[PDB]
Design a binder for this molecule. Structure first.
Ligand SMILES: Nc1ncnc2c1ncn2[C@@H]1O[C@H](COP(=O)(O)OP(=O)(O)OP(=O)(O)O)[C@@H](O)[C@H]1O
Ligand SMILES: Nc1ncnc2c1ncn2[C@@H]1O[C@H](COP(=O)(O)OP(=O)(O)OP(=O)(O)O)[C@@H](O)[C@H]1O
Ligand SMILES: [Cl-]
Ligand SMILES: [Cl-]
Ligand SMILES: [Cl-]
Ligand SMILES: [Cl-]
Ligand SMILES: [Cl-]
Ligand SMILES: [Cl-]
Ligand SMILES: [Cl-]
Ligand SMILES: [F-]
Ligand SMILES: [F-]
Ligand SMILES: [F-]
Ligand SMILES: [F-]
Ligand SMILES: [F-]
Ligand SMILES: [F-]
Ligand SMILES: [Mg+2]
Ligand SMILES: [Mg+2]
Ligand SMILES: [Mg+2]
Ligand SMILES: [Mg+2]
Ligand SMILES: [Mg+2]
Ligand SMILES: [Mg+2]
Ligand SMILES: [Mg+2]
Ligand SMILES: [Mg+2]
Lengths: 289, 289
């Protein structure tokens, strides 16, 4: 019942991680806290890291889910690896001490078994990763009811709201460059993000459902091309293209999706290290759980 | 006596090429296969033998039936799978000195044994680039009338715990990626050893309990289809009065004939799908039967 998110916030020492002390429970733990209304887990994680540690951070690989019982029902915390991009700590509302420890010492500092389990996930794969964000376009009504060229079918009111809600989510992962398939609804999905970054959306005719249907290899090739460029790209496409591209890349690399889906407005976070896939994390559409 | 063995048509994208192995002990060209070790199931032996004989890691898909042939000791019985290579390189080993990759036509020429040719004929009959849905009946769990608590909480017994452990290698041979269990403790516990191995959560599925299925079998079918449509190879652990019904419905819709059948606790149905359509339904006995 109670949804939360947090992080292993790290910095280059080789790495040190942040362990926080809170007076209420006199505990040592990883920074995390509750989703506010309208936030998704990554949005909440980045926010809570800032509030509890004073550091700005960019989320990378997901580090699984923790659940435990509380007074208000059940607590569920999703965790991310999060690289500090700077900031400074000062005792605040929730937290009065913060220590940066190398992993072995941090393991001994962390008193909850689940936090230790999260830290063990953290060290099991590279954490200095780049991120490709594959997004299914937002809701766009029904083909049946669109009088016009279906390629031009726009987002509906709900999908416009999904597009706005996606900016904070995608920014949590340090999105830098934007790409969309050659359909109105894919471009509109990331046009709020484009404004926020003052970036142009590159058009990708090779990544439409039609194009992929006739040459899937050209599309795979384009994806790796895009992935190879500097930065963390966002690629917004249609439903029939995503599953094929995600399964292809996952089995290549023996990466397993803990969660999975393909809903309108959903995001796959693909984490790469030295060009090799090290995570594939499926995020629900920003207005579903 | 009868010697139990298992193997595969190991293949990769060229459009497929298949692996044909040479063995100095008989100067033969054949498909990778070997004997079941103590307490091993057929699929676990096939995946192991593939790796030992070819150097490749692989994921098993559709079952290709069985062959029997005379040997000095009596009778050799070999079950076969289609298996997609997921990487590795061949190097000469204790059993195999050479490996060649060939298109199917040329493989049929290279394979000197009629029964290997029978198997390769079965392989080309249906698609092999398939997604796999693994439907598992929970392991043994005592009985309802001797359990004091709410029956939803009744746990696996000792034998059921052993079945759960033995399923890990069973389900990994088929490249399980994503985990689901009906809303009963005993279903979760059947896949908890796999969940520990993969370090992943188990999705809870209230629509897939016996009581939900009885009240709304359509919602159960729909939910199965939803799960089967997402990226990855899902494992779904459910109950004895749900499985037959789901498997019969799907086989009857797709006109798929299962070679074997059953519904025992700890058993697995391997459902192979090509473009969303069912192309195989392979019943695997519980790993301890
Ligand atoms: N990772 C954990 N595993 C097990 N128990 C925990 C964990 N973190 C906190 N607790 C315990 O659970 C209770 C609630 O603490 P928790 O930090 O979840 O709630 P909170 O104060 O509302 O903070 P937040 O806003 O950061 O979610 C306390 O008894 C605490 O010791
Ligand atoms: N597919 C087959 N059809 C007919 N005869 C075969 C076949 N494969 C092997 N043989 C022959 O059967 C005998 C036993 O060979 P086989 O490969 O079954 O057993 P093995 O040497 O124990 O190897 P494995 O451990 O791979 O089963 C040999 O004479 C061999 O030439
Ligand atoms: Cl649509
Ligand atoms: Cl077009
Ligand atoms: Cl299209
Ligand atoms: Cl959707
Ligand atoms: Cl039972
Ligand atoms: Cl049984
Ligand atoms: Cl079907
Ligand atoms: F918090
Ligand atoms: F919080
Ligand atoms: F908080
Ligand atoms: F062998
Ligand atoms: F063998
Ligand atoms: F062997
Ligand atoms: Mg907080
Ligand atoms: Mg809080
Ligand atoms: Mg907190
Ligand atoms: Mg908070
Ligand atoms: Mg052998
Ligand atoms: Mg062998
Ligand atoms: Mg052999
Ligand atoms: Mg052997």
């Amino acid at each position: 019942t109670v949804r939360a998110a947090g992080a292993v916030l790290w910095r280059d020492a080789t790495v040190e991680v942040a362990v926080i002390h809170r007076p209420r429970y006199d505990d040592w733990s990883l920074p995390k806290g509750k989703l506010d209304q309208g936030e998704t887990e990554p949005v909440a994680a980045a926010r809570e890291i800032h509030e509890e540690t004073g550091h700005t951070a960019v989320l990378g690989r997901r580090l699984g889910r923790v659940t435990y019982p509380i007074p208000q029902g059940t607590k569920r915390v999703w965790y991310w690896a999060a690289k500090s991009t700077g900031g400074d700590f000062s005792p605040n509302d929730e937290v009065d001490k913060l220590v940066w420890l190398p992993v072995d010492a941090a393991m001994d500092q962390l008193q909850y078994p689940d936090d230790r389990k999260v830290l063990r996930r953290f060290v099991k794969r590279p954490v200095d990763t780049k991120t490709v964000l594959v997004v299914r376009h937002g809701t766009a009504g029904r083909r049946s009811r669109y009088k016009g060229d279906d390629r031009k079918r726009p987002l509906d009111k709900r999908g416009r709201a999904q597009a706005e809600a996606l900016v904070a989510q995608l920014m949590a992962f340090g999105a830098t460059t934007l790409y969309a398939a050659d359909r109105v609804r894919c471009h509109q999905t990331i046009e709020p993000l484009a404004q926020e970054l003052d970036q142009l959306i590159h058009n990708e005719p090779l990544l439409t459902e039609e194009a992929y249907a006739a040459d899937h290899k050209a599309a795979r090739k384009r994806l790796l091309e895009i992935a190879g460029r500097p930065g963390n790209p966002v690629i917004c496409t249609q439903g029939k293209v995503i599953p094929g591209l995600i399964e292809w890349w996952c089995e290549r690399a023996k990466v397993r999706p803990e969660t999975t889906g393909n809903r309108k407005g959903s995001t796959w976070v693909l984490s790469l290290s030295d060009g090799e896939l090290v995570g594939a994390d499926y995020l629900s559409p920003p207005d579903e759980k």
